[PDB]
Symmetry: D3
Subunit: 311 residues, 6 copies
């Protein structure tokens, strides 16, 4: 009969869960009377966040979701599409990528989703998102892969399968029902839309996620080598023929420098396209990123640009 | 050659009509001069509404549309996709579901749409909407069934096939060209979008619609039985072991109570999920609904929850 | 030397006090994540209100202030212009006129202000207001009496001595340092300005205030007589020559009816200018007012309009 | 006793009247449903304007007011401060200066105000305004002369005696109760405040007003002489030593040119300060002004600047 | 395996290019201090526009894009999806249809897109748009043909394949990878969305584009014949039986009048639906359009309506 | 005759000058097309600021004004109320108090204003402000001293003589024509009103101003003594009986510590009322202030609070 996504959706929905968060946050004591004609400017306030997650490990009962949903939580509950409810405890979170991991207490008869290798994605691929944009429940929508933050190096998937005025729900799945990414919120504190959706790709979700299980957090790889700004003592001494950039004096730490095929003298000025002005420009950009990252540095020395792997 | 919806659209469009409403409304006499720096605060004012409808009965020439389009109308006109124009008179309207019925005067060579049984819908099904979001004409758009207010009990279809910033047009149709619902406006007085579209499902449209033909209106089923609040004389007397809710003293009226499998003593506290706090909470929620409704009541008495059918 | 208000201000300021309110209020539990692109929609929340008051009785330590400052208070503190602080307990409040009365605990060496008879005010009289518009402290400002809600019958003083974008402070005083009114907030919940200031005149403040001491509240005088709508049985029977209004059948209750010089048959259609359309129009307008009121009723019977005194 | 303005106000108020306008205007037929998420885009609509006026001629019953109050009026009513009401017919209006003149029908026992010579005003002089900023009635406020559009040549009086967020009321009067100007609305269509008030000075009001009685309108004095742009045939031929401006070829029309002490050759480039760029710049600025104007032209010819008097 | 658009996208992307514009514009000199509480009111300012284009002629290196992207450009650069960059010079632009043409300097190994005949489009056809809505790069999205400004006479394609809050990108392509239209911006100065996308159809793009190559501009066809308004001398003389419209006296110019099958006497009152009120109404509407246009005129003379072809 | 301020204003205005600033500032290169539905995110841009100043030294030609008027200036011009214009060069500025000093080039026949001792001001004193709120020129307004940041210790004068929606003009003068303060802008970058005006008092203006002449800037007095936080090694060792505050270990620097009557052990927790929480809380608050300041510290040691004088 008629083509439909219902068939695969019925095999995927059991892996998608609903998350009810109850948390408290420190807030300013309201100053009054309230005068709506004035530009003005501590107590605990209870809040209720809500969102979606995907079951990533059925035996352990690990569930990936968004940090903007589970942040400051005090009690978190989970409901499977069948109706069953469980308690869950937090296991790790990451404000930068807006990814967080939770663990179901007493997991039983759970179905984990199969994760696809995101490195295989291509722009015109079809995608469907599964989330909760208005708090009314699990809503599913479809579209295609609009942009790839690499294939088309610390990527991001842009998809037109994203709901207007809604909160970046949960799962981004392909036609075979496999997880290709988790939809996130770029404008964090505000689960919100920019007009198109962004998602961490599944491989990154997997990497980010194994780290939270192993360390309670994702280890930041802030790692240059030990260099000296351009125009300084040991820096100016050399080339300076096509100057303007971030100089690199040493490389011995052997931190993806004896691996980056980088040695003394170099002068990096790129990090996936954006020109690396200063030297600290580098120290910062390359340090706020998640271990295992694959960023690329356009290096100067008359031909040189390799890809790094954090750690 | 290439896949297209044009083929089925050409078999459906003849059933979709354009509605031009001319009406008058009572308005406040403007107070002036107008000072845009002030927060301030009767005559008849002519207005022009516009919208879409679907031909539901070709011999009778019955056309379903939205109450926010035909409300306060004084003259209503209809244009078929072929160009022909007819006059129409109102036959019934319903602000709650935003559905209204009109009748074409001198119907001739009309094509009614075939209505599908909406109980068969499933979330990943494909849908296409046909309406007039900007007043520029008949615009068609497609997507899928994002949520079902029951299948996934007084449902609602949520579809991502809904235009941004537009007025909830008319028809919601499936791939075989059959009516699966009429797109409505939840924010009534303002044909508007919340970010995703809602539609009354076809079966409800059919029920709602037969009622307007038969009574000029949809009969409200406000029908409990005759009970007595919880904690009162005849209520407190019993159980009160797992209290907190709406008590039910009698059931003899035999109004889906001798049918709800409900008898004296009970204590209902649900109506499709939302906890029934008070007793009037019940009297109100279950009374504003359209006859024939299928709502469900989570009843307390240590195991009891049946589905009702208004009347 | 140079003219100044400082001289009289130094004799008045000791009567003007600062009020620090600490209160709790029931609020909605924040729903999140917060999406600033959505139109959405219980716990106790502590708040801090702030305002001004005037010492009206030094022995008893009675202080008049605004109900929008002391509403929902749990702890109220008072600081005299000299620095001394006292605790105060609430004694009465009135949302309608925005007036409230508080009592200082352990009053000692207090100076009450002298109240002037407001019936003597005239439009071009000079006035000075003393309050706290931004929370920064006691700010004084001057101007004149811009309008009188009677002299120029349940008056109101309009004064151009009112601060832009500020909260209607406290006292309105004349050139001899006497209280002529308390500045209030017409837009209650929002201590705010409309562009000019309003104040309850001192005589009303005095009346309103004696009532809160005597009853914990100001007694509402909802008192017609016992009549019967116009066009009804006993109403239509009579005149109806210059109809259109509120009929009056009886008067025996002797409630400012045997005092209003009103008797059976009458047909009132005025209440200080505004035409009294219906009969309940009267029942409502004349019932929300504070006892002792002096409202006027343009009565129909070919010449008749007297002034009433509630109770 | 205490200083007050009440004394003089009681001698002035009888000259200040209240104006109730009932008018109709051509408006767009509302297009619906109304979607508040859309940027969109004829019938007669009745409106009610309201404002203040001053009695300028008691025998004739001439009343000056604002054109933004009486524009498009169909019925105009007038109430004296004593309560009496009269009908009035329009006699002239002027959108440019926002001044209009009306005539009372059956004037009787009227008191006209005495007009002061505005040429005598000085910045620190005291002023009081009398108007109706919120529609609540006659409100009076005071302040000083903040700026003079000449004394400090087609002046304007700026006064801090102007109400926040209100509609530029009516009269501007000095301490002896004499009219020194009518407060106007610079932002016409919106009786509104810029933060300080503007008023046509009394002498201009008098001139503007005598013209409306005599012609139904104020005659525009668009009058150069007949010249030829700078850089043209007969223009470039001469000087051009300190060029850049508006050339003047002829002067024979004898229109304040044989009076402006202006003759062939000249090159005007000023009109009360603002540099006269082009030649039409002059034709326009000097033509939209009211006859009898006293504008000044900084003329070039190595020393030349005289003041003109329209006509 | 799974259906995808990636396959055809890989054959199309090479034809889609990125355009970086650097231009200067005349702007007002900022007046300060900036007071955000005031409604206020020349130098050159450099700006940077950005957008998309499609390679329409590989040998010549002609690239079509939007006039709102290339307007006021001083330097324009182009990057092919492979990374190569070229300089380009402007060749023609058209604010009305928002289409502009540029030429690549030193074109080499370029792939032009194949253009489809837009006259063949039908509403349910599938479409995909390729553009740059946020400046982040080339983003592709899909949907269907929602409306046709003719097929369903100076058409426009409306497509739901348009990104929310983004700038109308570039190309609109069908499933075989052929250009069916260029997405434009109706709200010009603001690359922006109305909620659905508009595009000039490919045939018009082709016509508009050949004109800019041949004349530096698209020649406007402002061409009636030479008639005389309705009710005038030679107009009223005739019929006037079903009057109300634009009269047509002559036709001899032979400008699609000896071609429009139009002769003396006629009275046109239509231009693709919209009633032609006045005679200049016609002169204007039919003159702002692009040569080669196919507009239709509902002509009066008891049966007459032909389609014109500009020139 | 009638009271007026004109008399004294004529003796003061010659000291008040008009300042025309022409400056350049570094700004972001506009990114386009401009999409008003997007939340987005270097070149020199010329600006024109405008404001008022007061002649403080006639021989030297020193003029005080606001830093928000003269900041980033490249050319500054000055016009005396008589018409004469001079060039001026900057001599010092201070963003904190918004005061700046300029010097007239070729001063000649200048009249300096006489400065009054601001320590003598009292709340009900009369004041008049002279400035340029809309750019239209010199506007004068009057009112009274509403609040004193000390008399009623690093004061501020609050005056109701401040124009709505305008830029804090220049001079604040008393009835004898003497400077009592310069009106400033608290919301700096935006010459703007909060609803009432603030002014640096004349004595501070004098102190601030002598410093800019002597050092090009006002020397910041960041000066504690050298102490050690509360709860630390040498701090906890002592008292701690009524703890909670900023400890003070040493005092030997003799910086208003051997002058503050302060010695080892102390524990300051006040700075003119506001409780000094931390120790750095002190280091910061007392360091951003202008030398010569008179701030007061509520010191703990069972009775101790003296006033300091920076340096």
């Amino acid at each position: 009969q008629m083509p439909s996504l219902a068939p695969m959706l019925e095999k995927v929905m059991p892996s998608v869960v609903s998350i009810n968060v109850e948390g408290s946050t420190t807030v300013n004591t309201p100053r009054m009377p309230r005068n709506f004609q004035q530009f003005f400017g501590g107590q605990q306030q209870k809040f209720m966040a809500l969102g979606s997650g995907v079951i990533i490990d059925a035996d352990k009962g690990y569930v990936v979701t968004n940090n903007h949903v589970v942040d400051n939580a005090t009690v978190i509950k989970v409901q499977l599409s069948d109706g069953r409810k469980f308690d869950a405890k937090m296991v790790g979170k990451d404000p930068r990528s807006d990814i967080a991991l939770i663990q179901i207490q007493n997991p039983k008869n759970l179905t984990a989703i199969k994760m696809a290798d995101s490195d295989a994605l291509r722009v015109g691929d079809y995608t469907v998102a599964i989330g909760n944009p208005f708090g009314l429940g699990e809503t599913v929508t479809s579209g295609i892969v609009s942009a790839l933050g690499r294939s088309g190096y610390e990527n991001f998937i842009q998809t037109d399968a994203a709901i207007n005025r809604g909160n970046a729900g949960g799962a981004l799945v392909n036609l075979n029902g496999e997880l290709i990414g988790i939809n996130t919120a770029i404008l964090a504190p505000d689960g919100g839309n920019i007009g198109i959706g962004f998602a961490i790709p599944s491989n990154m979700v997997k990497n980010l996620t194994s780290q939270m299980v192993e360390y309670g957090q994702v280890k930041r790889g802030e790692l240059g080598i030990m260099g000296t700004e351009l125009n300084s003592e040991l820096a100016k001494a050399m080339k300076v023929d096509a100057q303007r950039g971030a100089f690199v004096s040493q490389v011995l730490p052997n931190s993806s420098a004896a691996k980056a095929g980088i040695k003394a003298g170099d002068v990096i000025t790129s990090l996936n396209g954006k020109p690396i002005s200063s030297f600290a420009a580098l120290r910062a950009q390359v340090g706020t990123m998640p271990v295992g990252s694959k960023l690329t540095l356009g290096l100067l020395r008359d031909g040189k640009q390799v890809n790094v792997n954090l750690e």
